[PDB]
Amino acid sequence: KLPGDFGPPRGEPIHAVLTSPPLVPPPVNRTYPAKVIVELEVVEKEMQISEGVSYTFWTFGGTVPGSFIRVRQGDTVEFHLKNHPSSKMPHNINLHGVTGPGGGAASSFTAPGHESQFTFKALNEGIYVYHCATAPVGMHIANGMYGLILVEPPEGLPKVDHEYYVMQGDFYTAGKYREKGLQPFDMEKAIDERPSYVLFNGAEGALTGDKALHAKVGETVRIFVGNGGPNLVSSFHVIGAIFDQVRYEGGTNVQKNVQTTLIPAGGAAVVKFTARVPGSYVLVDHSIFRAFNKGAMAILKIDGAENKLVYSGKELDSVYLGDRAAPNMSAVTKATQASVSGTLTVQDQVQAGRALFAGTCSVCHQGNGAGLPGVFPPLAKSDFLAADPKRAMNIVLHGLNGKIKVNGQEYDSVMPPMTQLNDDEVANILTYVLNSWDNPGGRVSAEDVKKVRAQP
Amino acid sequence: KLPGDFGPPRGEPIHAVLTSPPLVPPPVNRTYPAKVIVELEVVEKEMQISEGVSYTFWTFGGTVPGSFIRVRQGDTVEFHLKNHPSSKMPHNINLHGVTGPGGGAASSFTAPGHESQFTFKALNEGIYVYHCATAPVGMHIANGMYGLILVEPPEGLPKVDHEYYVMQGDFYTAGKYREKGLQPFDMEKAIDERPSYVLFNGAEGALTGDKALHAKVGETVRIFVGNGGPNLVSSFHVIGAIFDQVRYEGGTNVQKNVQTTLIPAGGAAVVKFTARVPGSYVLVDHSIFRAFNKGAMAILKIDGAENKLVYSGKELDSVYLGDRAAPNMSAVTKATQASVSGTLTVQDQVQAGRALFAGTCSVCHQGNGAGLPGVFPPLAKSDFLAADPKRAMNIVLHGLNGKIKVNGQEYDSVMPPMTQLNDDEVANILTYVLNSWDNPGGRVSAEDVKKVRAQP
Amino acid sequence: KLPGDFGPPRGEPIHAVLTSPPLVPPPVNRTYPAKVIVELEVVEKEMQISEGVSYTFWTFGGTVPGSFIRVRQGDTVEFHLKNHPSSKMPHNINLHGVTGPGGGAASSFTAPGHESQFTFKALNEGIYVYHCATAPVGMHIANGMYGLILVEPPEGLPKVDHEYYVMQGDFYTAGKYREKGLQPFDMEKAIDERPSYVLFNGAEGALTGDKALHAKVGETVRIFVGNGGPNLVSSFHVIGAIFDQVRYEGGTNVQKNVQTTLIPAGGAAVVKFTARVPGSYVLVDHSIFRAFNKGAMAILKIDGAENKLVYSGKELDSVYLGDRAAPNMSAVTKATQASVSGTLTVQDQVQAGRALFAGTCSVCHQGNGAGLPGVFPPLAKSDFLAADPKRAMNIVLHGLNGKIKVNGQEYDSVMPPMTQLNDDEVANILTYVLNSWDNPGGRVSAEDVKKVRAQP
Ligand code: HEC
Ligand code: HEC
Ligand code: HEC
Ligand SMILES: O=N[O-]
Ligand SMILES: O=N[O-]
Ligand SMILES: O=N[O-]
Ligand SMILES: [Cu+2]
Ligand SMILES: [Cu+2]
Ligand SMILES: [Cu+2]
Ligand SMILES: [Cu+2]
Ligand SMILES: [Cu+2]
Ligand SMILES: [Cu+2]
16 A cells, blocks of 8 residues: 555545644544645744844744644645735745655745645654745745644544644844844855754744743643754753653654754654653753854743652752743833834833843842852942943953952952843843942943944 | 674675766675675866866765775675876775774875775675775865765665665865856865855756656665765755655664654765655755755656645646756856857857746746736836846845836835855846847846946 | 652762763662762863863863763762852753753852752663853853763663763864964854864863773773763764664663764763774764864774784874874973973974874875875975975965976975964974974974965
């Protein structure tokens, strides 16, 4: 035979359940093959890739990753691709797991305002990436045109308590990481495989803080994990936990009891986790500068009873989660909007600075600015700061070392430079400091920082 | 014992069958261990890495990848490496799967005009990369000095209908992708792992168009897949199909039913495919900018009956294959030769432009230049073009957006910049357009494009 | 239950055995669960990353990688992290394999002069990376803050003759590869994943020459292999041998009989090797420019009887090991110290040049400078050199091609440029040549080379 030889479609056609990340459609829960009608529409739209940073995404179903598709092995799928009339570009679809030329791309070419259709049998069980395959293919994928399709085995997957949808992608902005405004696609960075962001589910903080995934102690969690690329291979890892199982695509091999696993560009895996201890468990790309400098972190938050026999210790997770430990960074979004409108207040800056100060400065100066006597000097009521508040701009951008004295105490240490911070970020952080802990007040502007950055 | 303990060589020595890519030597078809004499010669030679782009390759047996070697586990191999007297460099060989220092490299050091020999027992069954290991090793490998050796299990591999040889490599030219002429090796790009080309079998289009691999519906195909590197890891994938099996080197684990698989730098795998539906099936490195911007695409073309129950849809594959959908791009080769000779005609430019227009422009403007009314403006008999044919150079290089009117119709859309196109490519494409569809004619030269590219 | 449900700790607390690379603590050799007290101290210190190149490493226990920790699955581990008072930075620890938030990082935040403690049960058997997780996490890891923890299965691992500890890392210096002096961390290179060094065990030559690992023909060797990253994925490979087994972390799957294996950033594997033939077996990252241009090579040296039936050939391994074939390159270290002190002699330069000449020049000009008549011209008593010893600086930096005559013999070949050599390296190499083989003598200085490099 062929694989997936389960008989002809039976019953009425089914109009398929699509879901937006991070949710999954329900199990199909049937024992017969069906004709499944899938309707998916392309929408090109601006969304926030980071706080105060807009990007023109190209999407399947209005999200990155695109809508999740769920069918049964042996189903006949009638696929309808619509391209919204607001689109500027033509689009198509290639579904991994399809048996046929281009995985559909050859038959789904769709101009703005049009619709295409093609039909395929799902022979191949597994989790599979789908993506646009319109020239230039790389640009389409880089702009967010990918998602997952699950083809269930005929008996269905084993029951779990939660199923989630998480997809990594690499993104290429003309501006640098966290540079505000509408950021165009940068073809030069893309060709060179030098992304400015590496993200889960299309944005920094998409799955952190108040947007974390949830489960309880004792529960099992399945995550359908994709890597849309376009270019990067993920050293996919869960901090502080282990995967009971990892299965790639439709593969017969299943790895068990691993914590770090390589997902190819265009690859997908199903992972399973059992919650044992409460807290935040972090999904990262363990090519570590991606996770901690470019946005590649997502959270699964577990609630329930402690188990001190398994893990007994403090819970100070801002030291690595940094500015993503908090529920959100909406103050940054708001300050950026106000700056664009020309209505930025001191308090707007202060609250944005407060959000950014977490991790970035607090790891050494503490959340209250007290420092640690003799080791990290205070920012709280700092005579050194007050003596020349402007010099703080140079200190942040270019670091500080050597002997200094602060609130009558000697320091001889090293503060690394932080030149990667953008002008608004430095301004906002310093404005927060100046207006906290009985410091002199005032404000620093982005334009002030720009001038200091530019001196030799 | 050791592994491969099958007895002493029997019979007469065998003088081994070497083959050029993409073919494989026949199965050894024997039940006893032999002494196998291998003779392989290094040749340094210019070949075309892309149409009109020459490169000085360093080769084992005159090809990239080098000649395929096939032996049986337990054989004693007497290896003779010759370095042709025309070579400028010394060379040697390291065969993965050899048990001994340097995999042979230590004993096969061979100056131009000389020959070396060493003997090894093939203890280890599997598919293995071989490559040069002469300082600087990276430069030798980057210049094309790698291939595969198969060491069969004693009972032989299972019968299939076709066996093919495909090897990925990353290449480092001083010039940019598709910049014409003889391109030197670029050490700086190589150290930084920033290749200009990523190719199967040593050239763009080596396995596309009229050079595709072939099979029929129902047939099984084994591909011996290598990654010579030097630096890249391939997210190796078949578009529109699945691998029945993937086996790395001589490993005991075999993965089944996967579509995307990671091949390490210096790694090799045996994959198996069963043809089910007619059409072109694309082998790519799914770090997508490699596949679609740097040459990393190869084709397996399947002929036979349609199976509409499995796949039913149109077959417009130029939308992703682009300029590699056609049998070849020989017009580009020819135009480049003519340009070098100072005998480039308008028609030379037109035919080269026609080849490059596929995908690159046709995805939006159509193959006939008609566009799509209101969405993509026409190039065919375009008043906007005719009004200022020179401005077309800026449109290609730097894009166009905003309200415009063309053949009495309003457009308000976005044409992305295409700055990665080389000066000759832009010139040739525009010359094609000007001389097609009752457009005004004339020509654009590479020197014209160069001037426009250089303005602020 | 949970996994690792073996009963409560019994007996007295055990104060755990830590070891420095490349050694491993002994097998725990017990059949009951224990309370294990681990004491690990962070020390920030300058060490030599390469000969004459210093770097400020941040370390767990004074080494890179950090001290190896060995416990039994089911143990309760009381972990004490001390941060030495000389440290400038705060630090913490995340142990992969820990079940709990941050793998401990959340509870081990430790300022200079302080100590922290947290307790965890080792539920998960396997080899696991541990690393610092203090913001900015990437900088901490890049500076060398990683190591391995082994959690044994309850019955212990199978007996082998040797166990070794090898950990890859990528490093980011402001200066270029082999540029002398104290090299700061370079954040820009790190974010871009463009390392200047890629090393085993924290330094070039850490495991080469007289620092190689050892075993004998017939013996089995287990290596606990880590990849600390921060960013790179290793195409981990043994030259001239094969791995009997490769097992990732605590995974249930075990691959057998492979030579090349991908280790994720933050990943760890246990590999097993059986010595069959004498010689040097090279562990590399087979992204080849890492192994041969950035330091990613380590040696296992096997002593014992030859087996000519398995491998019969010469042993000229300087052709690929290059300057790492010799016991060390201490002459380079010494010349650099002398240069810094202003006491650099001609002989200091000569001996440093001699060390660097191996591979770099000897592959073509031979170890004795004789060249090969008609193919590679002589450096020994070279009239061409003597005629204009200064022009040798341009020859090394920028190459030489075309017809030339040397000791009354015609050459028409190509010497590639070697611009990646640093000014001191070129100076020292040429000083060696001038003072060898009855050449005219004199010296070339680094400042001379600097001037020539800077001309147009
Ligand atoms: C890794 C530790 C660390 C981080 C992170 C850090 N600092 Fe510092 N900072 C120091 C140390 C140590 C000094 C003292 C340097 C010396 O001894 O020369 C210092 C000095 C200062 C000073 C001048 C002395 C004083 O107390 O007024 C200012 C202002 C300052 N830091 C602000 C910041 C701000 C704002 C941030 C975040 C953008 C930040 N620092 C991040 C460690 C750090
Ligand atoms: C992704 C879609 C797309 C691709 C690919 C594309 N174009 Fe365009 N092109 C457009 C659109 C849309 C416009 C109109 C822009 C506007 O509305 O401001 C345009 C405008 C033009 C115009 C001016 C208007 C006219 O009709 O004369 C020329 C000339 C042109 N394109 C040529 C090319 C050539 C040649 C190529 C390939 C090198 C190309 N274009 C590739 C979409 C595209
Ligand atoms: C890959 C081969 C190769 C390597 C490696 C190499 N050379 Fe050469 N070298 C040549 C060849 C061939 C020529 C002659 C070029 C010609 O024919 O135009 C040459 C020429 C020379 C000459 C001038 C002719 C003479 O004999 O005096 C000098 C000096 C020289 N090399 C020094 C060096 C030094 C020092 C190194 C290492 C830093 C080095 N070369 C590395 C091959 C090499
Ligand atoms: O556990 N590493 O981020
Ligand atoms: O199926 N991806 O090119
Ligand atoms: O065997 N490769 O270096
Ligand atoms: Cu698209
Ligand atoms: Cu794909
Ligand atoms: Cu070679
Ligand atoms: Cu190799
Ligand atoms: Cu640290
Ligand atoms: Cu980690």
